[PDB]
Amino acid sequence: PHLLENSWTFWFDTPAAKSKQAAWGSSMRPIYTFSTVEEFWSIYNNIHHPGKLAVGADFYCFKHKIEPKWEDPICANGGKWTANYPKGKSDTSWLYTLLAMIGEQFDHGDEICGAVVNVRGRAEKISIWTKNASNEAAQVSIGKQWKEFLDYNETMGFIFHDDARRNAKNKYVV
16 A cells, blocks of 8 residues: 555544533544555545535644644644635545645644644634744744645735744744
8 A cells, every 4th residue: 555654643522522511522533544645535525525514623643642732742832724615625635735744745734743624614724733833934834835726816824823823823934
């Protein structure tokens, strides 16, 4: 098969699970960890894609052993680039984000922690979570390259997790 440079883990945080939640994200579940190109397709095409997820669902794909959390120590000093999509219109962009990540396509790919798609009421969001937020040059490269991979033709912002940790403002914009 075709071994990936890294192992990745799919997590769901479902509305149902959130309903039972003790704290934010305590509900998040690692569903599956894949290590090859073929194993990716195997699990990916057998799970819910954002266009078929209920409002409130968060769907993650993160490097193995990284928790998708501000307070995860690998994530702590990082941030996120965010793209916005209309309801039901993010599936293909979700996929390319994933294939770009697992294929290690980003020039500055070492900073990459993972991505998430957030299914909401009016729209859907995709964010890439990165590691070394203060490395503007890295983050700016990544975001620019992500637009290119997505053919996203709108401005996108990078928000530091620190700052996050709704009145959080974009530190960078591409």
